[PDB]
C-alpha cells in the first residue's frame, strides 16, 4: 500500500474503439441531453439528469458494446487548482449508505463524494430501470475530470451494491480520489474492469497531491504526445516512469483534448459529441 510501481511501461492493451466511444459518451454530458433518440457512436441516449451547475450532468445510454453506460460530466462546480486547505479536499469516511462494503480506514475526498452522493439514488434508479427495459446485464461507468473521480466512486458502488455488479469503467483525466486503502481496494474489486486514460501534459491526475494522503489505483494508459495515437500502459499504482517524467502544463488544453480520435472538449467542445471525428 502507498508505494510507487517502478516496473517498465508496456504496450497499450485496451480496446481503443471502446475508449473512443466512451470519450464521446462523456463529452455529450457537457451538452443538453433531453433530445429523444440521440445516437453517439453505437449508443442511444436514454435519459439525463443534472445540468452542470448544481450537480454534474449524468447521461444513461444503451450500447451494444458497453451495455447500460452511465456517463458523468466533470465541469468546474469547484476548481481543483484552488486553495487545498478547503473542506472540498479533506479526506472523510465512506458515506453510511456503503461504508459497510469498504475496508476499515478507507478515506475519500469530500468534494467528489458529496457530489456523487447528490446523484447516487437517481443513478441507481435509472440504471435499474433501463437494465430491465433493455434486458441488459452489463453496466459501464464513464467520467471525465471531476466526473471521472465521481465515476470511480460510482463504478465501485455499482460493483459493491448493485445486482450484476460492474462491466467496465473508462475514466478520462482522473483526479485522485481516495487514500492508499481505497486505491488498493479498487485494484482488488474492479482492477480488471478499470481503465484510466491520461492525455499529454494534463495536470488533473496530479491533484489532489499524494502529500495529502491520496493514491491512484493501479494502471493508466498515457497518450504521449498529447492527442496522438501513441500510448503505453504504466502498471501498478503511481508509476514512477509515467506522467511526472514530462512537465505538466497548467491549463486545460490536453485535459480537454483528443482521446483516440474523439474530442472531450468540455463546455466549449463539440455538441453533440462526435465519436471518431478527429
Ligand atoms: C490537443 O487538442 C486540444 C483540443 O482538443 C488542444 O487544446 C487547445 O489548445 C489551444 C491553445 O493551446 C487553446 O486555445 C486557447 O484558447 C483560449 C480560450 O479563451 C478564449 O475562448 C474563446 C474561444 O473562441 C475566444 O474567442 C476568446 O478569445 C477567449 O479568450 C484563447 O484565449 C487562447 O488564445 C488560446 O488560443 C484551445 O482552447 C484548446 N482547446 C480546448 C478544447 O481546450 C491542445 O492544444 C492539443 N495539444 C497538442 C499537444 O497538440
Ligand atoms: C522497479 O525497481 C524496483 C527496485 O528498485 C523494484 O522493486 C521493482 O520490481 C521494479 O523493477
Description:
- This protein has 278 residues and is α/β, with parallel strands linked by helices.
- It has a single domain, classed as 3-Layer(aba) Sandwich (Rossmann fold), CATH 3.40.50.1820.
- 22% of the residues lie in helices and 22% in strands.
- The strands form three sheets. Strands 1-12-11-10-9-8-5-4-3-2 form a ten-stranded mixed sheet, with helices on both faces.
- The longest helix has 16 residues, at 146-161.
- The protein is globular and about 45 Å long.
- The structure holds a molecule of 4 linked components (NAG-NAG-BMA-MAN) and alpha-D-mannopyranose (MAN).
- Alpha-D-mannopyranose binds next to loops.
- It is classed as hydrolase.
Number of domains: 1
User: How many helices in DSSP terms?
Assistant: 5
Termini separation: 39 Å
Shape: globular
List the ligand species.
Answer: a molecule of 4 linked components (NAG-NAG-BMA-MAN), alpha-D-mannopyranose
Strand order of the largest sheet: 1-12-11-10-9-8-5-4-3-2
User: In CATH's first tier, which class applies?
Assistant: Alpha Beta
Q: Helical proportion?
A: 10-25%
In N-to-C order, the SSE pattern is EHEEEEEEHHEHEHEEEEE
* Count of strand segments: 14
- The CATH homologous superfamily name equals Alpha/Beta hydrolase fold, catalytic domain
Strand content: 15-25%
Radius of gyration, in Å, reads: 17 Å
User: Would you give the CATH topology?
Assistant: Rossmann fold
Alpha-beta classification = alpha/beta
Largest sheet entry: 10 strands, mixed
Q: Architecture, CATH level 2?
A: 3-Layer(aba) Sandwich
Amino acid at each position: 500500500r502507498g508505494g510507487s510501481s517502478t516496473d517498465q511501461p508496456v504496450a497499450n492493451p485496451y480496446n481503443t474503439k471502446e475508449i473512443s466511444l466512451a470519450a464521446g459518451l462523456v463529452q455529450q454530458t457537457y451538452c443538453d441531453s433531453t433530445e429523444n433518440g440521440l445516437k453517439i457512436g453505437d449508443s442511444e441516449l436514454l435519459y439525463t439528469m443534472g445540468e452542470g451547475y448544481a450537480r454534474q450532468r449524468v447521461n444513461i445510454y444503451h450500447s451494444p458494446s458497453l451495455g447500460i453506460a452511465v456517463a458523468i460530466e466533470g465541469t468546474n462546480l469547484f476548481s481543483l487548482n484552488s486553495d487545498l486547505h478547503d473542506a472540498k479536499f479533506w479526506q472523510e469516511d465512506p458515506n453510511e449508505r456503503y461504508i459497510q462494503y469498504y475496508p476499515k480506514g478507507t478515506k475519500l475526498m469530500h468534494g467528489f463524494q458529496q457530489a456523487y452522493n447528490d446523484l447516487m439514488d437517481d443513478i441507481f434508479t435509472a440504471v435499474k430501470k433501463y437494465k430491465k427495459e433493455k434486458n441488459e446485464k452489463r453496466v459501464t461507468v464513464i467520467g471525465h475530470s471531476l466526473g471521472a473521480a465521481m465515476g470511480l466512486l460510482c463504478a465501485m458502488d455499482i460493483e459493491l451494491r448493485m445486482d450484476g455488479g460492474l462491466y467496465k469503467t473508462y475514466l478520462f483525466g482522473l483526479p485522485r480520489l481516495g487514500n492508499p486503502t481505497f486505491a488498493s481496494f479498487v485494484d482488488q474489486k474492479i482492477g480488471d474492469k478499470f481503465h484510466s486514460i491520461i492525455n499529454g501534459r494534463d495536470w488533473v491526475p496530479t491533484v489532489p497531491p499524494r502529500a495529502l494522503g491520496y493514491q491512484h489505483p493501479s494502471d493508466y494508459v498515457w497518450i504521449y504526445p498529447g492527442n496522438s495515437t501513441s500510448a503505453k500502459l504504466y502498471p501498478g499504482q503511481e508509476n514512477v516512469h509515467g506522467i511526472l517524467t514530462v512537465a505538466r502544463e497548467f491549463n486545460n488544453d490536453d485535459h480537454q483534448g483528443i482521446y483516440f480520435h474523439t474530442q472531450i472538449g468540455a463546455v466549449m467542445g463539440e455538441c453533440p459529441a462526435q465519436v471518431g471525428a478527429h
